[PDB]
Design a protein around this ligand. Structure first.
Ligand SMILES: [Zn+2]
Lengths: 64, 69, 304, 131, 19, 115, 62, 57, 192, 97
């Protein structure tokens, strides 16, 4: 709500790295801010997959 | 918990070396690599076996069910 | 055409080093098939002796009984395997154990606290009596006719200093382990070699001359005794190829990315056999050859 | 029996992420339009640019058996001999055809007129190369 | 930020078999 | 399971005579596939292999706290220098021979020690 | 806490129709972890010895 | 039988987790050689397994 | 016997090569056999008489019914001088020739794979595969020709000899790329 | 017993046959295949392990005629014995020296 994307980034920052755009690569490692953003995205993916596993069950059983 | 008789990867006996390794490390300022070199272990499969033994049997023995404490 | 004579004319052995424990010889102009066959027969099918069927009377030690049985069966025994024969399966287990194929290793120990225990003494070598059980404690005892056969042989572990179990006062171990013949392919405790492997002789094809300081660094890429500088003409030549371990540090430098090729001769193996203490590596290789020969012979003479 | 024969002048040799084999960019010095493009493993028949090579295609060398004592064939007169089956006869233009020969992958394309390429068919055909 | 400290005084460990 | 989420059931107790071996004369006790890495994208496993080999060779211990490196001091380079100083390959590759065919493999195999 | 009634005994997923008529536990059926084996034909499966001495099939003698 | 990790974090010693070793330092070969490990499987050494690799009760 | 014959003819894993979702293939080797194919069917790979024959026998084993001629058949070596060499594409060709029933034309197939020409270098034509009379002549085998991809060699073997022969081709290639990958192993590391 | 050729692939002239061997693996299969391939009379060789967990080995030798896979296998085994003998004799001589 303060406009910060993270504690380190300044409020309302015009910057790709602030806006979740990570410039690192897995070969030379990712900085902690990018690590936090990537953890957020990976967890979101896991939650979406967990929901999508059961979303189609009722549809398929009702059709069949 | 106690030093294994034979190295897993190869078979070179490292179980007659734990006390020798501890003595070499404590009596002198011998680094672990030097001690493992002097102890007959030159391949890393043997070297890690004595570099990375915990010897938890010491903590295990301090609970004797046949001795007043 | 390949013939036995055309192979005997070219095959050769160069025993570079020897010892009662570790050999390092060369097999030259032999096929990788046969060299690998020797290596695998050596590491698996060469018989040896180690305790298999333990008997436990008491074990109050911290070490689990099966863990101690595994540690005891692991330890090598300075026994020539040819002194005792093979054990049976269909025979009754009360009668399968003879005096010609079984070795009994008792181990009776009782840790007791030292009454003259010094103050400030942390090292357990003073506070307890027989706290540590070493493989030296495994004491061979003859059975039946073993007295007049194994008299000169002092049956001891090939290492008497391997640690078996650490005790505490009151705790006791009392066991008898029966030793028999076995092979490595059955269980890894019968493998008579700590290692047995080869490596083809590295080849360093220098295509363009390396002169000046360039040869000075080109030498530093390889182990110190592989490349040398010629006395008169400052250049690089391959001094001793065997001394080289193929690390390809040259290939990381572009100035040598086209002046050298790291090939490898395909018929020149460098064996390195380390006995586990039971026998000697020259005899290990000898029995590996004999096992391969007897195996081929048994296949040949076995009726079809 | 022979089906084709010539001598060729190499122009370009392309490594192309291939430790052994290479592609031959050639321009024959007899015909104004006879061209070759063959892949060979230079670990057996090494070739460099602006070098001269001989090419001959034979319907036979007189099932397969390795060479034995007292055997002769057309291969004795050349260095590199390869087996391949023609698979794609092409019609380029007037008095101009192309033939594609793949020798277990090592595709060879031959360009020129049918005044010389006529005897080539779509069947098994040996290839032979000499300096 | 100074780089990771280097473990100095490192010698050659791997010698070919027989050496 | 490795410490990087590379779980997997043991599929066969491969006999040591059939295991691949290297010039030094060691069969690795754990064989894992390389194809687990592209989709899973764990360079941590590779660098742990490198650091483990380097540490066991030099007798020392390797720290692995995140973000101690940068994009100018790659851990690959660091453990490669520590392997080159020990005599092994800078890229961690150990030239192995197949324990069945006896022939040397096509290219040097990535080996190391991991927890 | 309220005791199940007859309607509640066959109503829902854990009722009677779905839990005991559409899908039932069955005899002569095993289960175990799977492992790979590239040395069996693609229309085959690796049966452990312990199942092979337990699963059976009544063959009328002829 | 447990082993200390060579590749340990700095906090493996601040919290003192050497008292409960959860594993061992295994020689891992990133190699496609046997065919018995493609999707997610892995292969142990039979000899190493027979020398006490990962044993437990 | 009713259920035995049911599972053996209507539900057995060979009779379900494709799925009725869209009629696309669902079976085929997956990762390491594919990456080994990119190497054995590479143009740069040759194999001597012994290595070729060993690969073919280990893949086939006529004593287990993988053949059709009651005796293993062979192919002419690509190279005759200085010494007889073969090619990986010839290995695939003879594998097909040994599994495919006799007196039946081989699969004259034209398709492509997942590998662009410019990766192999200038003048390369490996993007397309040119099968003929039961012989592979251009391009390389890939995931696109065995796995989760359509219009491949195994798909056409299915389309031409039913699903049974395609199943046996899957099995035989599984035993071929396996025994091969033991000899020339596949790895990855920091250098890659 | 230990060695029995399979009638399913044997031929009446005997020039082609397949052998199934117990308690063997590459350690003998590869060496025997090499030695048999050294015979210029035979065309096909190579060995296959049916299933690793079973101690079995298969050797198939297709000759060019006038001989048998039986006698080709015998010749290969005898050549293996002689090769081991020359290795042993050279090793013993170099031990003496
Ligand atoms: Zn070791």
């Amino acid at each position: 709500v303060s406009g910060k994307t993270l504690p380190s980034f300044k409020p309302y920052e015009t910057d790709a790295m602030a806006g979740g755009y990570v410039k690192g690569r897995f070969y030379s490692g990712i900085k902690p801010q990018e690590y936090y953003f990537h953890c957020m995205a990976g967890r979101e993916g896991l939650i979406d997959t967990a929901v999508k596993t059961s979303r189609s069950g009722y549809l398929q059983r009702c059709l069949t | 918990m106690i030093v294994p008789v034979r190295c897993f990867s190869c078979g070179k006996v490292v179980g007659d070396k734990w006390e020798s390794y501890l003595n070499l490390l404590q009596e002198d300022e011998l680094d672990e690599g030097t001690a493992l070199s002097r102890l007959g272990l030159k391949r890393y499969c043997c070297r890690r076996m004595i570099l990375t033994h915990v010897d938890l049997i010491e903590k295990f023995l301090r609970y004797n069910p046949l001795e007043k404490r | 055409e390949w013939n036995v004579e055309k192979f005997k004319k070219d095959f050769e052995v160069n025993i570079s080093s020897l010892d009662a424990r570790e050999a390092n010889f060369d097999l030259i102009n032999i096929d990788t098939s046969i060299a690998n066959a020797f290596r695998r027969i050596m590491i698996s099918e060469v018989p040896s002796v180690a305790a298999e069927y333990v008997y436990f009377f008491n074990n109050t030690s911290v070490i689990q009984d099966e863990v101690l049985a595994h540690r005891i069966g692991l330890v090598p025994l300075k026994v020539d395997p040819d002194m005792l024969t093979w054990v049976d399966s269909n025979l009754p287990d009360d009668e399968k154990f003879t005096d010609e194929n079984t070795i009994v290793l008792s181990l009776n120990v009782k840790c007791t606290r030292n009454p003259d225990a010094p103050k400030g003494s942390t090292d357990p070598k003073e506070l307890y009596n027989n706290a540590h059980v070493y493989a030296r404690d495994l004491k061979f005892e003859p059975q039946g006719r073993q007295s007049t056969t194994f008299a000169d042989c002092p049956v001891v572990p090939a290492d008497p200093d391997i640690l078996l179990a650490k005790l505490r006062p009151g705790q006791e171990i009392s066991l008898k382990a029966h030793c028999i013949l076995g092979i490595g392919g059955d269980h890894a405790k019968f493998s008579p070699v700590s290692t047995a492997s080869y490596r083809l002789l590295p080849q360093i094809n220098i295509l363009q001359p390396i002169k000046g300081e360039s040869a000075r660094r080109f030498q530093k890429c390889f182990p110190p005794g592989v490349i040398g500088i010629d006395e008169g003409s400052d250049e690089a030549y391959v001094k001793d190829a065997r001394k080289d371990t193929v690390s390809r540090e040259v290939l990381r430098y572009e100035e040598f990315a086209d002046k050298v090729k790291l090939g490898r001769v395909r018929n020149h193996f460098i064996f390195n056999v380390e006995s586990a203490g039971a026998m000697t590596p020259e005899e290990i290789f000898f029995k590996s050859v004999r096992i391969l020969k007897n195996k081929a012979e048994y296949l040949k003479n076995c009726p079809i | 029996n022979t089906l084709f024969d010539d001598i060729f002048q190499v122009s370009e040799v392309d490594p192309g992420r291939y430790n052994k084999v290479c592609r031959i960019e050639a321009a024959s010095t007899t015909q104004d339009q006879c061209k070759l493009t063959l892949d060979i493993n230079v670990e057996l028949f090494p070739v460099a640019a602006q070098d001269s090579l001989t090419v001959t295609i034979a319907s036979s060398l007189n099932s397969w058996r390795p060479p034995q004592a007292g055997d002769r064939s057309l291969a004795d007169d050349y260095d590199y001999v390869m087996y391949g089956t023609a698979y794609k006869f092409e019609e380029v233009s007037k008095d101009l055809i192309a033939v594609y020969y793949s020798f277990g992958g090592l595709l060879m394309r031959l360009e020129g007129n049918y005044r010389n390429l006529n005897n080539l068919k779509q069947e098994n055909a040996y290839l032979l190369i000499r300096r | 930020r100074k780089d990771v400290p280097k473990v100095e005084g490192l010698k050659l460990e791997h010698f070919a078999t027989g050496y | 399971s490795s410490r990087h989420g590379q779980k997997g059931v043991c599929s066969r107790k491969w006999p040591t005579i059939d295991m691949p071996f290297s010039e030094t004369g060691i069969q690795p006790d754990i064989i894992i596939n390389p194809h687990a890495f592209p989709s899973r994208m764990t360079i941590g496993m590779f660098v742990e292999s490198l650091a483990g080999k380097a540490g066991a060779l030099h007798g020392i211990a390797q720290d692995s706290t995140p973000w101690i490196f940068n994009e100018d001091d790659t851990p690959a380079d660091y453990f490669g220098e520590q392997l080159a100083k020990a005599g092994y390959n800078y890229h961690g590759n150990e030239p192995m021979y197949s324990g069945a065919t006896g022939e040397e493999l096509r290219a040097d195999i990535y080996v190391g020690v991991v927890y | 806490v309220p005791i199940p009634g007859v309607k509640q005994a066959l109503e829902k997923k854990e009722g009677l129709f779905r839990k005991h008529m559409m899908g039932k536990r069955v005899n002569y059926a095993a289960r175990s972890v799977i492992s790979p084996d590239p040395n069996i034909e693609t229309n085959e499966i690796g049966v452990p010895p312990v199942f092979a001495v337990k699963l059976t099939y009544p063959e009328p003698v002829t | 039988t447990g082993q200390t990790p060579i590749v340990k974090a700095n906090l493996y010693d601040d919290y003192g987790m050497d008292n409960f070793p959860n594993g061992f330092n295994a020689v891992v070969a990133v190699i496609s050689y046997t065919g018995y490990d493609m999707d997610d499987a892995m292969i142990i050494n039979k000899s190493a397994d027979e020398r006490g690799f990962g044993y437990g009760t | 016997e009713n259920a035995r014959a049911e599972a053996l003819n209507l539900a057995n894993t060979d009779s379900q090569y494709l799925t009725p979702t869209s009629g696309s293939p669902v079976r085929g080797l997956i990762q390491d056999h594919i990456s080994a194919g990119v190497w054995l069917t590479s143009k740069d790979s040759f194999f001597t008489r012994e290595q070729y024959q060993q690969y073919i026998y280990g893949c086939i084993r006529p004593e287990d019914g993988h053949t059709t001629r009651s005796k293993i058949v062979t192919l002419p070596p690509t190279i005759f001088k200085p010494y007889p060499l073969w090619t990986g594409k010839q290995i695939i060709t003879t594998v097909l020739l040994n599994v495919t029933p006799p007196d039946m034309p081989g699969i004259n197939l034209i398709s492509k794979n997942k590998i662009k020409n410019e990766y192999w270098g200038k003048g390369s034509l490996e993007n397309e595969v040119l099968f003929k009379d039961g012989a592979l002549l251009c391009g390389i085998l890939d995931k696109s020709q065995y796995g989760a991809s359509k219009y491949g060699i195994v798909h056409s073997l299915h389309e031409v000899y039913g699903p049974e022969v395609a199943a046996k081709v899957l099995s035989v290639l599984g035993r071929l790329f396996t025994n091969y990958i033991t000899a020339t192993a596949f790895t990855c590391g920091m250098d890659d | 017993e230990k060695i029995k050729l399979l009638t399913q692939a044997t031929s009446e002239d005997g020039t082609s046959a397949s052998f199934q061997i117990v308690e063997e693996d590459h350690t003998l299969g590869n060496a025997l295949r090499y030695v048999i391939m050294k015979n210029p009379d035979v065309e096909f060789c190579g060995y296959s392990i049916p299933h690793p967990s079973e101690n079995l080995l298969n050797i198939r030798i297709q000759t060019y005629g006038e001989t048998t896979a039986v006698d080709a296998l015998q010749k290969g085994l005898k050549d293996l014995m002689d090769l081991c003998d020359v290795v042993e004799s050279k090793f013993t001589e170099k031990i003496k020296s």
